[PDB]
């Protein structure tokens, strides 16, 4: 089974992908991860987020620029998930497709219907054939909150620091909105909007 | 030896790459060719051309998304390009590192000393470990001789056009300018300015 948490920066995700991987695993099946982007292992990866660091020229002022980069990344993920599938009972992923919809969406003030998000479906599923996921949970958590633990994680972590997209709060908020109207569709596959209070145990038994 | 053949659109690099390739061959020595962008092998140069076709959003209006397109072409090009440079005894290259610095040069109305060109050699040659070439032979035809290649090769074939860098002369003109300071000033190695009416014969026999 192949399972891709979702949602805004700071909301949660790296965590949630742990209380839920280890329960899970309190149930004989075996879990794996991977997160996107896959820095180190991918260079359009790297490269995106170095531009959204304020490097590479023009780089990040193009919304489908950064897209592409997210996607090639992942496009260059396609053996290394189906491997993962195949191996493992469960796959759980720390962003994936549906990323690329919501954020892109939310730089063009565009809704989940839009263009950019049709473009990322046309291009990542149908082109570049990436799987689609049993399931996507959209960790939905206040623009406000979610930003606070981005601010916090910046100040607490000295070589590190928000990006072009987490210091853009208004992106934030849109990106969250786009995000509830992609699970309400059932955009890529079908989807579970939890929250901060979801009990993993629980969770993970829905996901089957 | 790794030879790369340089030069604006509708130059004749297509062509001079065919008759050079030949007159290798009448030497007992065996030759290799590449050109790029590898479109159909390379997701990234695809989605760069069909983006100077008026495809993706906002992606080609980024001379710093293009040209990582570019580079993350050759990139996923390193084992085929050092593969064929270990099995035959001459590679020759129709466009390479340098035309991202050219072009990307050229359309920020920089010259061959500007940050874009350093950039491509950081990204390139430094950063992904592209091998530098030998020889970069720079095919010099004058911007209106070659624009009317590219316009004359448009008209010639049904399924075709020139794409947003053919169809803008100014940026063609500036390429060819950045060239010729490349050339001079031995870029990524040593250059060998030629022309139309080279004779492959020799210019091979120079390439040692
Ligand atoms: C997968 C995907 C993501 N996104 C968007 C969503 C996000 O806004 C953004 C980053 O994706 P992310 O949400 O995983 O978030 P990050 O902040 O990248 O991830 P982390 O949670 O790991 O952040 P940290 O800040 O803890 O960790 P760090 O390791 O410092 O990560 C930052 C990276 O950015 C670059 N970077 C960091 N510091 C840098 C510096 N000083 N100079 C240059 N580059 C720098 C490096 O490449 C580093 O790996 O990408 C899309 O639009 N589409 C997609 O398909
Ligand atoms: C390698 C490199 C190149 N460039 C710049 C230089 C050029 O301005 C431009 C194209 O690179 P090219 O010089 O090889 O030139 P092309 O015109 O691409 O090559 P050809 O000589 O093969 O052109 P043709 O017009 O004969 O052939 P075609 O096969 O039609 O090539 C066009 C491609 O563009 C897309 N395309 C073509 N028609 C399309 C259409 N209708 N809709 C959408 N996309 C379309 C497709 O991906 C096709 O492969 O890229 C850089 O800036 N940096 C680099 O590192
Ligand atoms: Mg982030
Ligand atoms: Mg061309």
């Known amino acids: 089974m192949l399972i891709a948490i979702e949602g805004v920066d700071g909301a949660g995700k790296r965590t949630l992908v742990e209380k839920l991987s280890g329960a899970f695993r309190a149930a004989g099946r075996s879990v794996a991860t991977l997160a996107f982007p896959r820095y180190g292992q991918s260079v359009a990866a790297d490269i995106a987020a170095e531009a959204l660091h304020g490097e590479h020229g023009d780089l990040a002022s193009s919304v489908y620029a950064m897209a592409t980069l997210f996607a090639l990344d992942r496009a260059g993920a396609v053996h290394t ?10 796959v759980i992923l720390d962003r994936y497709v549906a990323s690329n919809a919501a954020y892109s969406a939310a730089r063009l003030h565009e809704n ?3 263009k950019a998000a049709a473009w990322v479906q046309r291009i990542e599923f149908a082109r570049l054939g990436l799987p689609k996921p049993d399931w996507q949970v959209l960790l939905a958590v ?11 994680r910046a100040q607490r972590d000295p070589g590190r620091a928000r990006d072009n997209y987490e210091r853009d709060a208004e992106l934030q908020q849109r990106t969250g909105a786009v995000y509830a109207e992609l699970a309400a569709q059932g955009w890529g596959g079908r989807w579970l909007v939890v929250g901060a209070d979801v009990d993993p145990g629980r969770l993970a038994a829905t996901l089957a």
Chains 1, 2 share one sequence.
């Open 81 to 90: 998930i189906q491997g993962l599938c195949r191996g493992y009972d469960v």
């Open 142 to 152: 206040s623009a406000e909150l979610a930003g606070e633990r981005s601010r916090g």
């Open 112 to 114: 989940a219907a839009g």
